[PDB]
Amino acid sequence: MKYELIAKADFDNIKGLSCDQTYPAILSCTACSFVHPKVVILTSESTIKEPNVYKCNWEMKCHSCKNDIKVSIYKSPSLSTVNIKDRYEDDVLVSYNPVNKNECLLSILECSGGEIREIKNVPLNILTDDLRLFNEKVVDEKRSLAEVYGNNKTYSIINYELEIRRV
Amino acid sequence: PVKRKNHGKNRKNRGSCKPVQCDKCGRCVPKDKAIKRFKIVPLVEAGSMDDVKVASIYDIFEVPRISYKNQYCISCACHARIVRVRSRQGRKIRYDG
Amino acid sequence: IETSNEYTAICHIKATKNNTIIHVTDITGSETICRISGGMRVKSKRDEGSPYAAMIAAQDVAAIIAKRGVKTVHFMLRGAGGVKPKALGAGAQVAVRSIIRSGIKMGRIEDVTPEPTDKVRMKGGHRGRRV
Amino acid sequence: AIQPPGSYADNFTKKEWYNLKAPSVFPNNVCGKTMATRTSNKQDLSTLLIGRKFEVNQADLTGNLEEHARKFSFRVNEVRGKDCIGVFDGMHMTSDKIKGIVRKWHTLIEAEKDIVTKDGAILRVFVNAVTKKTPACTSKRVYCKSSDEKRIRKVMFDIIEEELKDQDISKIMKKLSQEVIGKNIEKAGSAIYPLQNCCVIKVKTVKKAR
RNA sequence: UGGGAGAGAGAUGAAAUGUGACGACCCUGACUGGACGAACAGAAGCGAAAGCUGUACACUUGUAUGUAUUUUUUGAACAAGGACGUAAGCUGGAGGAGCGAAGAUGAUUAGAUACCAUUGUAGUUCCAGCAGUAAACUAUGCCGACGAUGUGAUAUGAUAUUAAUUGUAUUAGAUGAUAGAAAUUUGAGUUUUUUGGCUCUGGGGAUAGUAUGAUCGCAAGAUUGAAAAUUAAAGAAAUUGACGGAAGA
Ligand SMILES: [Mg+2]
Ligand SMILES: [Mg+2]
Ligand SMILES: [Mg+2]
Ligand SMILES: [Mg+2]
Numbered sequence: 091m092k093y094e095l096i097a098k099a100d101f102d103n104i105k106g107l108s109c110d111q112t113y114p115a116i117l118s119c120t121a122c123s124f125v126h127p128k129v130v131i132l133t134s135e136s137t138i139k140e141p142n143v144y145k146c147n148w149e150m151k152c153h154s155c156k157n158d159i160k161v162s163i164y165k166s167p168s169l170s171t172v173n174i175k176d177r178y179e180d181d182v183l184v185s186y187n188p189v190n191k192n193e194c195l196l197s198i199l200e201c202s203g204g205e206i207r208e209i210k211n212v213p214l215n216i217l218t219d220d221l222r223l224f225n226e227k228v229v230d231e232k233r234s235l236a237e238v239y240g241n242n243k244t245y246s247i248i249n250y251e252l253e254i255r256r257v
Numbered sequence: 258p259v260k261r262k263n264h265g266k267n268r269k270n271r272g273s274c275k276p277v278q279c280d281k282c283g284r285c286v287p288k289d290k291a292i293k294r295f296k297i298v299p300l301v302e303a304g305s306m307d308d309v310k311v312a313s314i315y316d317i318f319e320v321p322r323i324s325y326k327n328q329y330c331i332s333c334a335c336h337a338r339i340v341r342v343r344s345r346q347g348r349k350i351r352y353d354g
Numbered sequence: 355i356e357t358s359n360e361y362t363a364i365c366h367i368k369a370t371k372n373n374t375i376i377h378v379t380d381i382t383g384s385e386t387i388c389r390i391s392g393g394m395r396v397k398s399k400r401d402e403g404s405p406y407a408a409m410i411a412a413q414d415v416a417a418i419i420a421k422r423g424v425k426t427v428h429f430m431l432r433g434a435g436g437v438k439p440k441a442l443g444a445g446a447q448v449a450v451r452s453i454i455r456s457g458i459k460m461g462r463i464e465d466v467t468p469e470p471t472d473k474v475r476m477k478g479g480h481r482g483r484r485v
Numbered sequence: 486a487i488q489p490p491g492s493y494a495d496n497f498t499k500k501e502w503y504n505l506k507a508p509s510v511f512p513n514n515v516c517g518k519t520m521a522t523r524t525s526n527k528q529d530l531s532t533l534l535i536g537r538k539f540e541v542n543q544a545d546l547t548g549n550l551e552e553h554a555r556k557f558s559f560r561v562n563e564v565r566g567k568d569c570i571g572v573f574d575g576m577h578m579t580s581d582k583i584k585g586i587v588r589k590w591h592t593l594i595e596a597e598k599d600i601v602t603k604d605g606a607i608l609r610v611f612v613n614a615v616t617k618k619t620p621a622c623t624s625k626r627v628y629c630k631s632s633d634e635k636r637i638r639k640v641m642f643d644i645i646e647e648e649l650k651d652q653d654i655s656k657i658m659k660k661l662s663q664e665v666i667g668k669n670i671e672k673a674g675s676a677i678y679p680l681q682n683c684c685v686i687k688v689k690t691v692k693k694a695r
Numbered sequence: 696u697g698g699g700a701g702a703g704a705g706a707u708g709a710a711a712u713g714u715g716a717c718g719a720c721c722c723u724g725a726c727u728g729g730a731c732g733a734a735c736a737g738a739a740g741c742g743a744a745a746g747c748u749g750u751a752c753a754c755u756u757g758u759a760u761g762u763a764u765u766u767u768u769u770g771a772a773c774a775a776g777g778a779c780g781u782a783a784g785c786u787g788g789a790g791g792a793g794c795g796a797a798g799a800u801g802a803u804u805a806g807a808u809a810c811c812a813u814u815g816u817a818g819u820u821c822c823a824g825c826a827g828u829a830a831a832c833u834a835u836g837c838c839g840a841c842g843a844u845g846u847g848a849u850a851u852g853a854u855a856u857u858a859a860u861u862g863u864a865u866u867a868g869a870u871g872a873u874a875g876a877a878a879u880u881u882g883a884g885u886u887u888u889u890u891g892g893c894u895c896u897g898g899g900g901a902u903a904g905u906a907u908g909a910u911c912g913c914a915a916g917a918u919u920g921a922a923a924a925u926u927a928a929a930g931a932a933a934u935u936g937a938c939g940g941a942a943g944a
């Protein structure tokens with residue numbers, strides 16, 4: 091059961107999106123149709139390793155049926171890098187995920203015990219089409235963030251909605 | 258030293274026997290040096306014995322049973338605890354049916 | 355009296371450790387009334403042959419078979435057969451209890467596991483399957 | 486629903502219904518309903534109804550609750566109106582009673598023969614028997630000699646040829662349902678060695694009747 | 696290959712490659728090929744050994760039990776010579792369903808060219824011949840005289856009669872007795888109070904079944920078979936502890 095992270099909205103004057111590999115989610119067992127009532131935060135830094143049976147990124151044991159649930163996080167396949175200049179005249183290498191036509195991939199999830207239902211919102215990093223970078227933006231209640239640059243430049247997001255689809 | 262009187266199996270005054278095959282692993286074993294069990298199970302469960310009575314179109318009928326014979330090599334047999342290690346003086350007891 | 359609204363049908367069940375398949379047909383065996391397998395309702399590959407997914411696979415059978423006018427059902431149970439170990443799976447007793455529970459009467463139960471007179475060479479070497 | 490739909494690249498209403506008919510030797514000749522699909526008008530469905538086979542219990546035909554072990558299968562050759570007519574071509578015993586009669590420490594004898602009816606058809610029969618316990622109950626070794634298994638097999642050839650020589654199908658089917666063979670073979674075979682549990686297992690048809 | 700029906704089937708501790716809308720998998724109706732005789736099936740039978748289970752005929756062959764049948768000492772074991780000999784492996788023709796070394800892919804791993812899984816050739820099947828090795832083990836050469844009770848098994852004769860106990864030849868097991876370093880044991884007994892007859896083999900470990908010569912074989916290889924330089928141990932049966940990614944209460 092291989093899922094993905096895909097953001098779809100109306101985009102203008104952006105070049106890419108970036109985030110931290112951390113997502114709160116609601117999980118559910120596949121032996122019993124039971125929804126875990128509490129949200130669970132998952133990180134790409136927590137490692138659990140056994141030598142010859144399995145390896146995983148997060149671990150869980152069910153309460154109703156005691157079935158094992160293993161979650162693992164992978165990185166994005168289409169990950170590219172562009173140079174950028176700072177305020178002072180120098181060069182710095184940054185990494186980002188390129189926005190395609192009305193779509194953008196972030197990360198790959200995978201699961202061998204249970205399902206994923208809903209993922210919460212992450213404060214993503216926005217890349218400017220005309221070669222600039224801003225650190226941390228949080229999408230508001232309207233699901234639409236707009237910000238104006240000083241020299242009469244504007245970028246915006248319209249109707250930001252997250253989705254998951256198994257492959 | 259010698260461990261058992263008959264060495265591995267109960268074969269006397271013969272030269273050879275054709276081999277049979279285990280069900281779990283599938284290695285060849287001679288038919289004398291095998292472990293064979295017999296058990297008879299019914300088609301219906303005892304937990305579902307009363308519930309067929311309300312659904313029967315017939316008045317009275319018999320529930321049928323089937324038999325089975327199994328064969329194993331001795332590596333598979335001791336692993337599934339069909340046959341266990343016994344005492345040295347208690348090895349000579351033979352439980353015929 | 356045998357109307358088009360009520361008749362007698364035969365049910366085949368093929369249960370192994372990996373999967374259970376429920377196939378119900380008429381008295382001849384040439385036309386399929388309904389056929390729903392246990393793997394079609396489950397989502398994880400480990401749970402195709404579980405007794406949990408079989409009772410889901412038996413209850414949706416009783417819903418569609420009520421539309422096509424079946425009153426009583428005969429039963430044919432079998433295993434894997436051949437060179438495969440032929441023993442009855444876990445989902446055998448689960449399926450026969452759930453169709454009866456919905457209100458359908460049973461006619462006859464028979465055991466049809468095909469047993470060979472002689473075997474062919476099984477999988478595995480002279481020393482066997484060693485895990 | 487393990488398979489996602491984007492990963493890999495009502496005819497029940499238009500179906501006609503018919504009735505089955507057994508041969509009229511058994512008092513319950515009605516068996517059940519079948520199905521057939523009519524494609525369009527000016528079509529004859531009689532080609533599809535011939536080649537099928539059905540199988541009915543013996544106890545449902547006889548209307549009796551005593552015996553249920555034997556089983557009969559019939560072949561369709563002709564349609565009248567909404568009815569389908571059958572003829573006897575197959576018989577076999579149930580699998581659970583076949584496995585029950587065999588035992589350890591006891592001699593099993595079996596035989597077979599090909600035989601021809603009054604019409605142009607050839608049949609096969611199978612006969613089994615096991616040995617009986619003597620009142621000399623000291624022996625667990627109730628095995629019989631291999632010389633006497635020849636002699637009991639010769640008597641098995643005689644009664645098969647005598648009971649089913651050239652009699653017609655009405656005498657063929659009723660002689661099997663009444664078990665006339667195994668009881669007569671139990672009296673005759675018991676002279677050399679006492680037997681029990683004599684029965685008929687299966688009846689096979691070799692070639693069809695014109 | 697003819698009918699019905701329309702999404703997954705199959706494997707694992709858990710999965711992956713591989714596989715299915717040119718329609719599998721399941722239930723049905725007919726066909727063609729190759730291999731093999733389930734359950735009964737045993738501390739039961741036959742064979743010089745390797746070995747030998749579907750039915751009916753044809754040819755051919757053992758050991759044992761009974762007995763006023765012929766002949767009259769023709770016997771046991773064997774250097775030279777001769778025949779048979781599972782499984783692979785070779786040349787020639789027939790065949791090829793399942794299984795499958797070598798080769799190639801998917802996972803595990805520090806590393807796997809190994810265990811796991813998917814494919815895949817020679818082979819294993821038949822006929823005609825070479826080849827001569829196995830833990831070919833009862834690890835116990837062949838012939839001959841005497842031996843303690845109890846429960847069995849195969850064949851067959853006498854007494855006896857529906858109730859038994861008895862003869863000869865093989866064979867399984869238990870308890871004593873002997874012998875043995877001991878485990879064990881109707882011979883592995885009748886032995887320092889050592890002898891009925893006949894063939895073959897061994898002399899502390901390692902070098903080594905290795906070199907060299909000779910005789911066999913289409914080949915692979917088989918039988919026979921040393922030494923120079925080295926070393927104080929190698930080994931068999933059994934008690935007491937310690938350990939087990941060993942099992943029960
Ligand atoms: Mg041997
Ligand atoms: Mg047989
Ligand atoms: Mg004898
Ligand atoms: Mg000499």
Ligand SMILES: [Mg+2]
Nearest residue numbers: 774775776777
């Ligand atoms: Mg010689």
Ligand SMILES: [Mg+2]
Nearest residue numbers: 779780826827
């Ligand atoms: Mg030779």
Ligand SMILES: [Mg+2]
Nearest residue numbers: 828829831917
């Ligand atoms: Mg040798």
Ligand SMILES: [Mg+2]
Nearest residue numbers: 830831832834
């Ligand atoms: Mg030797």
Ligand SMILES: [Mg+2]
Nearest residue numbers: 831832835836
């Ligand atoms: Mg010898």
Ligand SMILES: [Zn+2]
Nearest residue numbers: 119122152155
């Ligand atoms: Zn659960």
Ligand SMILES: [Zn+2]
Nearest residue numbers: 279282330333
């Ligand atoms: Zn095994």
